[PDB]
Design a protein around this ligand. Structure first.
Ligand SMILES: CCn1c(-c2cnc(C)nc2)nc2c(-c3ccc4c(c3)[C@](C)(Cc3ccccc3)C(=O)N4)ncnc21
Length: 900
């Protein structure tokens, strides 16, 4: 118990709330989650001790690898006859050995060649390869070029520097995990829903804590929903004065109880009124986590309305009671049937489905004629098959008419042969019919596997059914690589919020992965931790974090170092940002330096892992290199030395901007999308180099941004001394001065290509207007953008954010005055055309990634109408050639010529 108490304190520190707060929660779903989730913890720990110590090292230092071993053409073409030059260092004093080897050599073979080289100058299974300058290892027998560091080196024409290291020197530094099961580990009739012959009704008793002025009459609005879809008409109570909110009114709903789907929810509000306004809203699950239909009395504390939403109900909103109990509390009563009513078992559901299928297969021509949702097997023509195929290739937010829905449902057995149509078929199901839903379940049960990218759609707010979501998860388990899981983790974390219950298949999958791959676990922790201030999710996220922190092993202690460092920076910046706001930069800096040198602060702010990338060790702070930036919120530009033995080879100092006051969630999302765009272009042989620098939200409007070394804003360059006297050639002159001689062409090429990428990316995403201060350029010509605080339809009709002025065209056309009518500009135009269509071809991915972020509280991504902006910029309703022409016209109009 002494050890457990010490652990609980550590967990409490990591999560920002004491573990005893979870102990006090009475709700049995909460206590069941805490206990039942521990088998995932056990399973993970068993995987980590399977082939110890290798398996422990693989957890801590997983291979940082691309999904596909196979290289593109333009990557392979960088290799000298499929061979790579690599430098292998040995500590003995630092001895480099330069090897020329085949790109697809395994680490063991590379090590052998390094020893063979060292031999000539005058075994293999005792060593491992480490990347020089950071804590990344090549512990697994992949092709060398599949490691991302290696593939990145080949792309950029940089020399790979790897360090030879004894296995036992690594293994020795990996403490043993001793996972201990916590204390909490040790802990009428029953009738089917389908037997209850009755309509649905619910009683609204009264509201308490209804405090108001403006407001005159009020009523309780209600509705039965499956996701965002109504299952019957809404039902209002009688009108009442706000000074006495009592209704005592049974509402009757147009739905039979046996037809209630598993994820059916009651969505209600309190409204004032003719102009109607909702004062407070709340949703609840009609079945609980044990499959029991709610019965008896219930008190629901309601939530405040968010501005932007003016609709009367909020079915997309969170489900469950407000934790703040000093809020409008509506009391409700459900119907009682002398018995516990439970949702039926799968065997009962399957039997019903088989009964229906058998029944339908016997239907005559004339019977089938009675409903467009019925078809006969023989009738299915090739023309119907083509129409189905055509419906399947439409994007996720393309409308499916009622006629198409009937059509899809009637040909649901054929839809099995085109399994990517599943999302469209599922939205065609009558979710208020048990006859249809039972058959949908049996189709889902045996549905062929779909790609993870397609499966992820089925985890958004449009697909609440647990069988559909379970199918989605099975697809990720079979087909989602750790690489792609890392890439889509932000979205996968967000869709946890749409789960009806704490314990579910998705959260079990994510937790297992977080606890078997520490690179995943790190960001899993930080994405959860960053929203613990949000009361609509803090319980779910807090309990999930608890379960992670109990089983993640030694990394908990490293996370607590990061948490303490961030907490010290939050505290310092809060003080600057309140007590010294008015003071000069000089005095603020004097205060900051004095506070950071206090030995407790100094120890907390040095010697820990970068939250932006835990492969990067942050050593001693260089206070002389730190500064408070001019910007409004007083961001800290911070500089630590990299204490790696071979830091000189990667970077000697790690520079991070810490910012306390701005919401960084949209930048973080935009940077993720840019990286995904870049990856699509690279995999297609289209080499447009982007710069998706690190950005991590760590809390409520607090986060970290990776500094891009040796870069400058456009303004600085064209400022020089010089505005009325600005000259279009100044930027070209700068780059040229920086790239004299044989390299000039490489710099112009890099500028051109990077420019094309950002032109296309920013137009597609509707990013905030570009100007000379939020466009930056590196010495080598790489152009990139910063500050992605705005996106999509943020103006309110499609803007062009990145207007190529004469400055940029002059660089592209190598100094020529008439730069719009040149060869270089034509090749640049061609790059933009290819990039644009390449993204159009992957439009469903981008739509789905945005759809998964809808239930986040990001101000410019509130509904599917915001996402519709992308449908416009990618011209998805148009033809591919019509889309090209549309893109050309937007560029043409914005540039006043050039694009035709
Ligand atoms: C890639 C991320 N990144 C950002 C950035 C910030 N905020 C958001 C939301 N996004 C991106 N700024 C970045 C800067 C940068 C910004 C402003 C600026 C300078 C550098 C200098 C040149 C140097 C300086 C002086 C005093 C204090 C600090 C720096 C200067 O005088 N003003 N350099 C690299 N990378 C950046």
């Amino acid at each position: 118990n002494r050890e457990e108490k010490i652990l609980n304190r550590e967990i409490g520190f990591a999560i920002g709330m004491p573990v005893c707060e979870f102990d006090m929660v009475k709700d049995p779903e909460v206590q069941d989650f805490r206990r039942n989730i521990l088998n995932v913890c056990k399973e993970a720990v068993d995987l980590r001790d399977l082939n110890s110590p290798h398996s422990r090292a693989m957890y801590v230092y997983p291979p940082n690898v691309e999904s596909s071993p196979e290289l593109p053409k333009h990557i392979y073409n960088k290799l000298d006859k499929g061979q790579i030059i690599v430098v292998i260092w040995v500590i003995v004093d630092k001895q480099k050995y330069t090897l020329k080897i085949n790109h697809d050599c395994v680490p063991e073979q590379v090590i052998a060649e390094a020893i063979r080289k060292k031999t000539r100058s005058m075994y293999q299974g005792k060593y491992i390869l480490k990347v020089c300058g950071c804590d990344e290892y090549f512990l697994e027998k992949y092709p060398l070029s599949q490691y991302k560091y290696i593939r990145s080196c080949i792309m950029l024409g940089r020399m790979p520097n790897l360090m030879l290291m004894a296995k036992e020197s690594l293994y020795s530094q990996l403490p043993m995990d001793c996972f201990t099961m916590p204390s909490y580990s040790r802990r009428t009739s029953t009738k089917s829903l389908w037997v209850i012959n009755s309509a649905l009704r619910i009683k609204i008793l009264c509201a308490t804590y209804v405090n108001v002025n403006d407001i005159d009459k009020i009523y309780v609005r209600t509705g039965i929903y499956h996701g965002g879809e109504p299952l019957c008409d809404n039902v209002n109570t009688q009108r009442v004065p706000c000074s006495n909110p009592r209704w005592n009114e049974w509402l009757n709903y147009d739905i039979y109880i046996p037809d209630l789907p598993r994820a059916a929810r009651l969505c209600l509000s309190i409204c004032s009124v003719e102009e109607h306004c909702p004062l407070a809203w709340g949703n609840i699950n009609l079945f609980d986590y044990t499959d029991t239909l709610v019965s008896g009395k219930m008190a629901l504390n309601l939530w405040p309305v968010p501005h932007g939403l003016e609709d009367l109900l909020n079915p997309i909103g969170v489900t469950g009671s407000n934790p703040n109990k000093e809020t409008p509390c509506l009391e409700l009563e459900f119907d009682w049937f002398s018995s516990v009513v439970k949702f039926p078992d799968m065997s009962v559901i399957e039997e019903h489905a088989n009964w229906s299928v058998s029944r339908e297969a016997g239907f005559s021509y004339s019977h089938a004629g009675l409903s467009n949702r019925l078809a006969r097997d023989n009738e299915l023509r090739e023309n119907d098959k083509e129409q189905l195929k055509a419906i399947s290739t439409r994007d996720p937010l393309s409308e499916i008419t009622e006629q198409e829905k009937d059509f899809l449902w009637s040909h649901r057995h054929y839809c099995v042969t085109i399994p990517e149509i599943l999302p469209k078929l599922l939205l065609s199901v009558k979710w208020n019919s048990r006859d249809e839903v039972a058959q949908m379940y049996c189709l889902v049960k045996d549905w062929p596997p779909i790609k993870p990218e397609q499966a992820m759609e089925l985890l958004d707010c449009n697909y609440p059914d647990p069988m559909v979501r379970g199918f989605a998860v099975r697809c990720l388990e079979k087909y989602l690589t750790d690489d792609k899981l890392s890439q889509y983790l932000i979205q996968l974390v967000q869709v946890l919020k749409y789960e009806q219950y704490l314990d579910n298949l998705l959260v079990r999958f994510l937790l297992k992965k977080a606890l078997t791959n520490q690179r995943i676990g790190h960001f899993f922790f930080w994405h959860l931790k960053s929203e613990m201030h949000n009361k609509t999710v803090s319980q779910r996220f807090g309990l999930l974090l608890e379960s992670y922190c109990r089983a993640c092993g030694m990394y908990l202690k490293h996370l607590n170092r990061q948490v303490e460092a961030m907490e010290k920076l939050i505290n310092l910046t809060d003080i600057l940002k309140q007590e010294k706001k008015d003071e000069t930069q000089k005095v603020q800096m004097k205060f900051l330096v004095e506070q950071m040198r206090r030995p407790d602060f100094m120890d907390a702010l040095q010697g820990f892992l970068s939250p932006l990338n835990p492969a990067h060790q942050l050593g001693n702070l260089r206070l002389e290199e730190c500064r408070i930036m001019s910007s409004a919120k007083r961001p800290l530009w911070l500089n630590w030395e990299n204490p790696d033995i071979m830091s000189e080879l990667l970077f000697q100092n790690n520079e991070i901007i810490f910012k306390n006051g701005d919401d960084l969630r949209q930048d973080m999302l935009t940077l993720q999308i840019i990286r995904i765009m870049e990856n699509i272009w690279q995999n297609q042989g289209l080499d447009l180099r982007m710069l998706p620098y690190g950005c991590l939200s760590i809390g409520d409007c607090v986060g970290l941004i990776e500094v891009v070394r040796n870069s400058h804003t456009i303004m600085q360059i064209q400022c020089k001394l010089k505005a009325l006297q600005f000259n279009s050639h100044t930027l070209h002159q700068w780059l040229k001065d920086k790239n004299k001689g044989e390299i000039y062409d490489a710099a112009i090429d890099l500028f051109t290509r990077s420019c094309a990428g950002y032109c296309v990316a920013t137009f597609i995403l509707g990013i905030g207007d570009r100007h000379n201060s939020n466009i930056m350029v590196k010495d080598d010509g790489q152009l990139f953008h910063i500050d992605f605080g705005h996106f999509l339809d943020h103006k309110k009709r499609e803007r062009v954010p990145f207007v190529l002025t004469q400055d940029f065209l002059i660089v592209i056309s190598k100094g020529a005055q008439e730069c719009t009518k040149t060869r270089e500009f034509e090749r640049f135009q061609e790059m933009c055309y290819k990039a644009y269509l390449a993204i159009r071809q992957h439009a469903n991915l981008f739509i789905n990634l945005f759809s998964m972020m809808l239930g986040s509280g990001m101000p410019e991504l509130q509904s599917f109408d915001d996402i519709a902006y992308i449908r416009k910029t990618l011209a998805l309703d148009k033809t591919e050639q019509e889309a090209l022409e549309y893109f050309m016209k937007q560029m043409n109009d914005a540039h006043h010529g050039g694009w035709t």
